[PDB]
Design a protein around this motif. Structure first.
Motif, mmCIF file in Angstrom:
data_model
loop_
_atom_site.group_PDB
_atom_site.id
_atom_site.type_symbol
_atom_site.label_atom_id
_atom_site.label_comp_id
_atom_site.label_asym_id
_atom_site.label_seq_id
_atom_site.Cartn_x
_atom_site.Cartn_y
_atom_site.Cartn_z
ATOM 1 N N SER C 62 0.565 -1.212 0.020
ATOM 2 C CA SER C 62 -0.015 -0.074 0.093
ATOM 3 C C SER C 62 0.774 1.262 -0.182
ATOM 4 C CB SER C 62 -0.917 -0.178 1.430
ATOM 5 O OG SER C 62 -0.480 0.751 2.418
ATOM 6 N N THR C 63 1.935 1.315 0.924
ATOM 7 C CA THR C 63 2.671 2.461 0.864
ATOM 8 C C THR C 63 3.302 2.895 -0.586
ATOM 9 O OG1 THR C 63 4.846 1.739 1.878
ATOM 10 C CG2 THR C 63 2.972 1.883 3.217
ATOM 11 N N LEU C 64 3.975 1.824 -0.994
ATOM 12 C CA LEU C 64 4.773 1.709 -2.213
ATOM 13 C C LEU C 64 3.910 2.302 -3.317
ATOM 14 C CD1 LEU C 64 7.625 0.898 -3.545
ATOM 15 C CD2 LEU C 64 6.641 -1.077 -4.060
ATOM 16 N N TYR C 65 2.588 1.845 -3.368
ATOM 17 C CA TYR C 65 1.767 1.911 -4.360
ATOM 18 C C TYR C 65 1.344 3.468 -4.284
ATOM 19 C CZ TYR C 65 -2.300 1.259 -7.448
ATOM 20 O OH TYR C 65 -3.152 1.577 -8.524
ATOM 21 N N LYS C 66 1.034 3.995 -3.047
ATOM 22 C CA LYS C 66 0.550 5.479 -3.078
ATOM 23 C C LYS C 66 1.798 6.296 -3.461
ATOM 24 C CE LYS C 66 2.074 6.976 1.061
ATOM 25 N NZ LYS C 66 2.278 8.636 1.303
ATOM 26 N N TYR C 67 3.191 5.923 -3.100
ATOM 27 C CA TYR C 67 4.189 6.607 -3.248
ATOM 28 C C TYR C 67 4.241 6.648 -4.697
ATOM 29 C CZ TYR C 67 8.925 7.313 -4.573
ATOM 30 O OH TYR C 67 10.198 7.878 -5.113
ATOM 31 N N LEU C 68 4.215 5.626 -5.380
ATOM 32 C CA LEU C 68 4.436 5.315 -6.811
ATOM 33 C C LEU C 68 3.420 6.344 -7.545
ATOM 34 C CD1 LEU C 68 6.149 2.516 -7.756
ATOM 35 C CD2 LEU C 68 4.421 2.453 -9.315
ATOM 36 N N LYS C 69 2.063 6.358 -7.210
ATOM 37 C CA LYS C 69 1.023 7.185 -7.712
ATOM 38 C C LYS C 69 1.533 8.538 -7.582
ATOM 39 C CE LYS C 69 -3.604 5.400 -7.321
ATOM 40 N NZ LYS C 69 -4.858 5.240 -6.424
ATOM 41 N N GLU C 70 1.998 8.965 -6.396
ATOM 42 C CA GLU C 70 2.409 10.669 -6.257
ATOM 43 C C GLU C 70 3.245 10.895 -6.765
ATOM 44 O OE1 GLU C 70 -0.726 9.184 -4.575
ATOM 45 O OE2 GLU C 70 -0.305 11.527 -4.561
ATOM 46 N N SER C 71 4.481 9.920 -6.910
ATOM 47 C CA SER C 71 5.694 10.577 -7.723
ATOM 48 C C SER C 71 5.463 10.465 -9.301
ATOM 49 C CB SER C 71 6.781 9.526 -7.490
ATOM 50 O OG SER C 71 6.969 8.463 -8.562
ATOM 51 N N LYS C 72 4.718 9.619 -9.883
ATOM 52 C CA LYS C 72 4.350 9.597 -11.429
ATOM 53 C C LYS C 72 3.479 10.722 -11.604
ATOM 54 C CE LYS C 72 0.869 8.549 -13.260
ATOM 55 N NZ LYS C 72 1.278 9.594 -13.935
ATOM 56 N N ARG C 73 2.341 10.968 -10.770
ATOM 57 C CA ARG C 73 1.739 12.011 -11.077
ATOM 58 C C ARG C 73 2.173 13.571 -11.078
ATOM 59 N NH1 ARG C 73 -1.666 15.168 -6.405
ATOM 60 N NH2 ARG C 73 -3.199 16.219 -7.666
ATOM 61 N N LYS C 74 2.922 13.691 -10.049
ATOM 62 C CA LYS C 74 3.662 14.905 -10.273
ATOM 63 C C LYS C 74 4.577 15.137 -11.292
ATOM 64 C CE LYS C 74 1.968 16.916 -8.037
ATOM 65 N NZ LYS C 74 2.515 17.556 -6.705
ATOM 66 N N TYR C 75 5.245 13.874 -11.718
ATOM 67 C CA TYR C 75 6.090 13.894 -12.965
ATOM 68 C C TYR C 75 5.394 14.103 -13.929
ATOM 69 C CZ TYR C 75 8.814 12.179 -16.892
ATOM 70 O OH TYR C 75 9.477 12.214 -17.972
ATOM 71 N N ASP C 76 4.250 13.604 -14.293
ATOM 72 C CA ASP C 76 3.437 14.008 -15.603
ATOM 73 C C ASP C 76 2.965 15.253 -15.474
ATOM 74 O OD1 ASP C 76 0.745 14.158 -14.392
ATOM 75 O OD2 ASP C 76 0.820 11.822 -14.030
ATOM 76 N N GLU C 77 2.428 15.998 -14.479
ATOM 77 C CA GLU C 77 1.997 17.156 -14.439
ATOM 78 C C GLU C 77 3.166 18.185 -14.582
ATOM 79 O OE1 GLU C 77 2.492 19.531 -12.264
ATOM 80 O OE2 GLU C 77 3.822 18.768 -10.728
ATOM 81 N N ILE C 78 4.458 17.736 -14.140
ATOM 82 C CA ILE C 78 5.235 18.884 -14.366
ATOM 83 C C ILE C 78 5.837 18.810 -16.020
ATOM 84 C CG2 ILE C 78 7.372 17.411 -13.737
ATOM 85 C CD1 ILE C 78 8.211 20.174 -12.228
ATOM 86 N N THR C 79 5.803 17.623 -16.598
ATOM 87 C CA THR C 79 6.176 17.703 -18.110
ATOM 88 C C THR C 79 5.339 18.517 -18.885
ATOM 89 O OG1 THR C 79 4.792 15.779 -18.558
ATOM 90 C CG2 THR C 79 6.997 15.141 -17.538
ATOM 91 N N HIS C 80 4.070 18.761 -18.584
ATOM 92 C CA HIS C 80 3.136 19.407 -19.416
ATOM 93 C C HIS C 80 3.323 20.920 -19.584
ATOM 94 C CE1 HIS C 80 0.818 15.981 -19.992
ATOM 95 N NE2 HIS C 80 -0.448 16.822 -20.341
ATOM 96 N N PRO C 81 3.727 21.771 -18.534
ATOM 97 C CA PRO C 81 3.829 23.200 -18.821
ATOM 98 C C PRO C 81 5.142 23.473 -19.504
ATOM 99 C CG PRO C 81 4.298 22.783 -16.566
ATOM 100 C CD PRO C 81 3.738 21.625 -17.042
#
Lengths: 45, 49, 81, 45, 47, 116, 31
Positions: C62-81
């Motif tokens: 669970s912890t690794l899954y939610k951390y993976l979620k947050e890291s990949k989400r912040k990555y994909d959002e930073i790539t856009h602008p």
């Protein structure tokens, strides 16, 4: 966990549900003359 | 209701649960912020599984 | 219990046909007795989905899954602008 | 018992002398009676 | 009237649900189910 | 730039995977040496790559991480196997001890398999 | 290991993830 082996019964996800239990019930009670069904159990209207 | 696939699912679930509990015992072993009782129980559960 | 081995004899030597010897057992042989059976693993997309929904858990998962979620989400959002 | 069976696979005499104070047959009985899998099986009974 | 392939099975009964259309839905759904399960009943999956 | 750090849970899961993989074979030689990203792949180091960082990860200024996962392949990424998880896909096969083992992992191996 | 690999909803190339995604796509597109 009241229903023992019904947990493991396969079913297609997200779409196109099939009802084995309710279909079997409606089929088996559809043969027995609703008046004697009303006499059998109080659940029936 | 398909009984053959139901038994297949039951058995595969047994196997998967065994594997996850072995992994969790390995996890409780590999970190040192756990106590001694937890570590000993993990090691001997690993042996049994 | 007594006098059982007074004049004992030697067994000459055996010729061993196949399947009459030690270490003569196979994985593909039938399991006549030996009550434990082997089952076919259910690898089919609906059955896989069901298993995934019913598989147990683990805290690290669970912890690794939610951390993976947050890291990949912040990555994909930073790539856009 | 557990560590000795993990060391020597099915050498029951070495496992017995590893445990000490118990005979091979008691080790085999206790090994067979251990409930390892039971929690993952469907029900209590 | 060319063939149209009938989109999602409950397409008809979502417009003026009637007895005949609902019976038709039940029939075709259970026919598909029966065929697939019979094919898997005797043969099995690709593995 | 933005800095992405690797938490302790990721490296713990990494060494767990490695321990299980090595405990798997432990016996076949030429698969176990005597000495001792569009998937689910992660880089195992802090990311901007400080060259001391990649050198530390290998032994257990900055360069692009894509070059690191070109020259070394599996060796850098968290869960690394032979043939797959790398970039160049010879005699090499899967199931090999690509990662060097710490002094702690070997003590744990001795704990889990006393016949060793 | 391989079974848990195929049942990896985080990895997008995993089979189960694609199956679930396409199933929800079709299910919501028809209804």
């Amino acid at each position: 966990n009241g229903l023992g082996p019904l947990k493991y019964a396969p079913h297609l996800p997200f779409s196109k549900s099939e009802n084995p239990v309710l279909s079997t019930i409606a089929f088996l009670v559809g043969l027995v003359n609703p008046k004697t069904v009303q006499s059998m159990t109080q659940r029936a209207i | 209701i398909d009984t053959h696939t139901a038994t297949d699912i039951y058995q595969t679930l047994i196997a998967l649960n065994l594997d996850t509990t072995v992994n969790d015992c390995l996890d409780k072993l590999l970190n040192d912020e756990c106590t001694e009782s937890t570590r000993e129980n993990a090691l001997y559960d690993y042996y049994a599984l | 219990l007594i006098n059982y081995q007074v004049d004992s004899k030697l067994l000459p030597k055996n010729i061993e046909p196949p399947l009459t010897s030690q270490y003569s057992t196979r994985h593909d042989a039938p399991r006549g007795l030996f009550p434990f059976e082997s089952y076919k693993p259910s690898v089919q997309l609906p059955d896989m989905a069901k298993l995934k929904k019913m598989m147990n858990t683990s805290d690290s998962e669970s912890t690794l899954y939610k951390y993976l979620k947050e890291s990949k989400r912040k990555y994909d959002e930073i790539t856009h602008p | 018992l557990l560590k000795g069976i993990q060391e020597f696979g099915a050498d029951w005499y070495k496992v017995a002398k590893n445990v000490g104070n118990k005979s091979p047959e008691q080790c085999i009985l206790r090994f067979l009676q251990l409930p390892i899998e039971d929690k993952f099986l469907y029900g209590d009974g | 009237p060319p063939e149209t392939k009938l989109p999602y099975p409950t397409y008809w009964s979502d417009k003026k649900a009637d007895t005949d259309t609902l019976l038709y839905e039940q029939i075709i759904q259970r026919d598909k189910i029966n065929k697939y399960s019979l094919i898997r009943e005797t043969n099995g999956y690709d593995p | 730039g933005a800095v992405f750090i690797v938490p302790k849970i990721l490296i713990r899961e990494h060494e767990r995977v490695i321990l299980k993989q090595i405990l798997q074979i432990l016996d076949q030689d030429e698969l176990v040496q005597p000495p001792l990203l569009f998937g689910g792949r992660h880089y195992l180091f802090n990311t901007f790559t400080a060259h001391m960082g990649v050198l530390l990860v290998l032994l257990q200024k900055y360069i692009t991480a894509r070059s690191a996962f070109v020259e070394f392949g599996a060796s850098v990424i968290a869960g690394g196997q032979r043939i797959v998880d790398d970039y160049w896909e010879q005699n090499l096969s899967s199931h090999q001890r690509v990662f060097k083992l710490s002094t702690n992992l070997i003590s744990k191996i001795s704990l889990l398999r006393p016949s060793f």
